Amino acid sequence: SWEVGCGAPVPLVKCDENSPYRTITGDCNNRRSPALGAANRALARWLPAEYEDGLALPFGWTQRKTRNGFRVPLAREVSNKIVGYLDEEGVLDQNRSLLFMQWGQIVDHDLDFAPETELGSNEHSKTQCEEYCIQGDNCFPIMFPKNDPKLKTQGKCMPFFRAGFVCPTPPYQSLAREQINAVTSFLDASLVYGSEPSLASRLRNLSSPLGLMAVNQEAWDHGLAYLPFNNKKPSPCEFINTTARVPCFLAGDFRASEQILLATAHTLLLREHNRLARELKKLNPHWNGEKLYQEARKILGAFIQIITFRDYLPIVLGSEMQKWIPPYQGYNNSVDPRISNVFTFAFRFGHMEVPSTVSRLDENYQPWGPEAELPLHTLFFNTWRIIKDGGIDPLVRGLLAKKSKLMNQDKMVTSELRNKLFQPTHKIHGFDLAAINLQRCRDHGMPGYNSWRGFCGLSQPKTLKGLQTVLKNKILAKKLMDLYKTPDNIDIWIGGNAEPMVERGRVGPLLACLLGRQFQQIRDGDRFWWENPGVFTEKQRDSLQKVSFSRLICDNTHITKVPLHAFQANNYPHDFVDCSTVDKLDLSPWASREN
Numbered sequence: 001s002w003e004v005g006c007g008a009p010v011p012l013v014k015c016d017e018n019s020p021y022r023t024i025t026g027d028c029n030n031r032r033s034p035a036l037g038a039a040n041r042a043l044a045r046w047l048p049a050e051y052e053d054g055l056a057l058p059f060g061w062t063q064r065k066t067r068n069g070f071r072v073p074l075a076r077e078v079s080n081k082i083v084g085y086l087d088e089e090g091v092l093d094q095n096r097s098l099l100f101m102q103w104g105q106i107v108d109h110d111l112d113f114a115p116e117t118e119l120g121s122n123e124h125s126k127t128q129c130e131e132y133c134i135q136g137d138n139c140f141p142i143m144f145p146k147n148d149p150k151l152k153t154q155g156k157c158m159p160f161f162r163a164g165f166v167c168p169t170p171p172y173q174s175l176a177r178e179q180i181n182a183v184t185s186f187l188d189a190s191l192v193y194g195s196e197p198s199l200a201s202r203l204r205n206l207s208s209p210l211g212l213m214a215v216n217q218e219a220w221d222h223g224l225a226y227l228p229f230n231n232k233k234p235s236p237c238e239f240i241n242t243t244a245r246v247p248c249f250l251a252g253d254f255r256a257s258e259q260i261l262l263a264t265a266h267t268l269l270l271r272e273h274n275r276l277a278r279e280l281k282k283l284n285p286h287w288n289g290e291k292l293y294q295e296a297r298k299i300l301g302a303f304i305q306i307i308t309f310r311d312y313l314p315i316v317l318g319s320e321m322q323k324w325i326p327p328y329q330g331y332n333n334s335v336d337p338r339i340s341n342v343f344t345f346a347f348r349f350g351h352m353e354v355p356s357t358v359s360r361l362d363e364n365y366q367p368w369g370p371e372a373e374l375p376l377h378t379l380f381f382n383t384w385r386i387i388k389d390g391g392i393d394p395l396v397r398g399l400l401a402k403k404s405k406l407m408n409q410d411k412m413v414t415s416e417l418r419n420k421l422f423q424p425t426h427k428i429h430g431f432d433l434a435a436i437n438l439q440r441c442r443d444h445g446m447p448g449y450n451s452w453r454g455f456c457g458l459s460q461p462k463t464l465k466g467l468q469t470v471l472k473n474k475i476l477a478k479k480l481m482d483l484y485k486t487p488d489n490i491d492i493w494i495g496g497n498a499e500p501m502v503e504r505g506r507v508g509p510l511l512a513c514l515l516g517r518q519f520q521q522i523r524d525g526d527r528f529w530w531e532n533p534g535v536f537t538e539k540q541r542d543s544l545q546k547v548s549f550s551r552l553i554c555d556n557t558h559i560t561k562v563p564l565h566a567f568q569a570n571n572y573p574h575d576f577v578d579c580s581t582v583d584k585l586d587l588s589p590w591a592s593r594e595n
């Protein structure tokens, strides 16, 4: 009765009964529907796609084609009028460390990646899009409004290329266009290990049966590993400093070097795998390389799950946590674990938590050198500042001692991302992540703000006064009505992020609902969830309960003082204790077995 078949790329693998570990692809997690949550398949649709032609063309593609009787505003004009601000004074979150932002980006990279269409190779398509700003097939350029300064300094557009879609990637089909999730839907440390067998093997050290991940052979951090380099050319990390010539890192996720603190967090996770593999080898000398790798991978997946659900989500969702994510009751094989298309926009709330600067701090939590503090835009695809300017410890100290940006209806996205974003192959620090998010909402066929309010059982404002009430902000509602003309047309990214945050949380009610529903699904629909009986033993679960980001730092850096609650705002020295007082992960329950 349905077109359920379509999975034409079809990374098809048969499933082995009673297999002890996760697949790299996420296949075989659900026994009845083994592709559920596997990588390189369609993002789930919680609601039907909304395209100007019903099938594939974004709203805004055809100038004369209205949405609900009104032209959709230019993404860059919404960015300029609503999202932008000048003054960074007073914008920081007084109760969230910068690790709060950074953990969000890490979790996001574990869960979803909808990359730009490949569209063949060695052609004049990408250059054409960038050079002449001509909309066509996959070229969906972000056009500058008449009063945009970038129209004066940067040409007529910011190049933008439509996301990849499942069955054919160049041609189309009879159903609506469905974008791809290139990573595993499960919270499974796919950002460390990869979501594809080829990358997963490339990341491993298969020279020794020690179960290790490959490490950098060119540079070391006071005896501790860096990720290997990606020696693919051209390299955006080389591009931004051709004197230093330091390549990007190779990780489980394609995007690991996008900014210096994401590369930092990736480095901690790689180190933690190798520490666990060494410690398991000492405990279990007869375990082979495959077994050591899998058991360390399983522990690192559980770490990521526990930090996320115990420490992170409660301070994102605040009062809505118990509504959307009740205490775990067990694996439910009827739950759809696939990441939804809308979730990939909902989780971009993080863009409003990114502050304008990154600091390096020394062994006394004092400024590291004469340029301790640097503008964020100079740190896009920046790996040389790690290798050649103190390794990761000074950056990790900044992650603990400095703050996230607080979402603000009058100060949404810092100009470091809104005007100075660097994109690989596009040469300039001149892109706008907010405009890109809005253009991508349309590229993906997103239903508008009121469709999602209805989905979440919330009021659907129809008038300026109704929107002013929901947003608790007259001027913001007025600016959104002036541009969108009806709240039905407001793009979900800006509408969800415009709502005032729930008590004890950092998102409003619409985003709490969309995020909370997704995180409930990826937990309840995961046969390898850490708390599911038989994944770990009772004694292993008791040991895992004691994981902390503070212990991760103590174990995989030379930092000797850390806070106990690393996601809150912490000040040195008052909130910092000796590493020796921080709980350890007791691996004794991983003994092959005893009597």
Ligand SMILES: *[C@@H]1O[C@H](CO)[C@@H](O[C@@H]2O[C@H](CO)[C@@H](O[C@@H]3O[C@H](CO[C@H]4O[C@H](CO)[C@@H](O)[C@H](O[C@H]5O[C@H](CO)[C@@H](O)[C@H](O)[C@@H]5O)[C@@H]4O)[C@@H](O)[C@H](O[C@H]4O[C@H](CO)[C@@H](O)[C@H](O)[C@@H]4O)[C@@H]3O)[C@H](O)[C@H]2NC(C)=O)[C@H](O)[C@H]1NC(C)=O
Binding pocket: 205, 207, 208, 210, 212, 213, 214, 215, 216, 217
């Ligand atoms: C995968 O996992 C393997 C290990 O299982 C990694 O292999 C090892 O890499 C490190 C470098 O990253 C190598 O260490 C070097 O060691 C020498 C000291 O050599 C002596 O001790 C070694 C350790 O036991 C041993 O392997 C050596 O034996 C080999 O070489 C001799 C000839 O010297 C030969 O007779 C033997 O038969 C072996 O072939 C030897 O006993 C040390 O001198 C090196 O340091 C120098 O170089 C670094 C920069 O490179 C510099 O910082 C120093 O100041 C100095 O200049 C270096 O520490 C180790 O030898 C490798 N082990 C094996 C078995 O080859 C591998 O790197 C992992 N790969 C990835 C991609 O992660």
Ligand code: HEM
Binding pocket: 101, 102, 103, 104, 105, 108, 112, 113, 114, 115, 258, 259, 343, 344, 345, 347, 348, 349, 350, 351, 353, 354, 433, 436, 437, 440
């Ligand atoms: C640079 C960028 C960041 C930090 C300096 C950053 C940060 C975050 C946080 C903190 C997130 C969540 C808590 C988060 C989520 C998602 N991002 Fe974003 N991000 C930076 C840069 C980008 C760029 C560039 C993109 C691609 C934009 C496009 O549409 O082409 C981007 C995306 C996302 C994303 C969607 C992932 C996907 O499914 O494809 C998040 C869920 N980020 N980032």
Ligand SMILES: *[C@@H]1O[C@H](CO)[C@@H](O[C@@H]2O[C@H](CO)[C@@H](O)[C@H](O)[C@H]2NC(C)=O)[C@H](O)[C@H]1NC(C)=O
Binding pocket: 240, 241, 243, 244, 384, 388
């Ligand atoms: C590119 O990287 C190099 C380091 O490899 C940076 O240079 C250092 O910068 C200051 C001088 O301005 C000094 O600490 C060193 O003498 C420099 N080293 C070298 C080799 O020149 C350089 O500033 C970076 N440039 C950019 C644009 O990021």
Ligand SMILES: *[C@@H]1O[C@H](CO)[C@@H](O)[C@H](O)[C@H]1NC(C)=O
Binding pocket: 095, 315, 568, 569
């Ligand atoms: C900071 O947030 C944490 C929860 O994230 C909370 O327990 C603590 O009371 C908050 N502190 C202040 C000062 O509000």
Ligand SMILES: *[C@@H]1O[C@H](CO)[C@@H](O)[C@H](O)[C@H]1NC(C)=O
Binding pocket: 332, 333, 334, 335
């Ligand atoms: C399992 O999932 C289905 C679909 O969400 C749900 O209707 C059912 O109540 C769930 N079973 C539980 C919570 O035991």
Ligand SMILES: [Ca+2]
Binding pocket: 110, 111, 183, 184, 185, 186, 187, 188, 189, 190, 191
């Ligand atoms: Ca994953």
